[PDB]
């Protein structure tokens, strides 16, 4: 569970900190 700048939330070890096309941040599942 690490943080990520330009964001107001955090992400767990289940998903990394990524972004979307809309313009908002979010934790996306790591590429397996």
Swiss-Prot record:
Coiled coil: none annotated. Disulfide bonds join 4-17, 11-27. It comes from the Eukaryota. This is Granulin-2. It comes from Homo sapiens (Human). The lineage of its organism: Eukaryota, Metazoa, Chordata, Craniata, Vertebrata. The gene is GRN.
């Amino acid at each position: 569970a690490i943080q990520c700048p330009d964001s107001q939330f955090e992400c767990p070890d289940f998903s990394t900190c990524c972004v979307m096309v809309d313009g908002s941040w979010g934790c996306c599942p790591m590429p397996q």
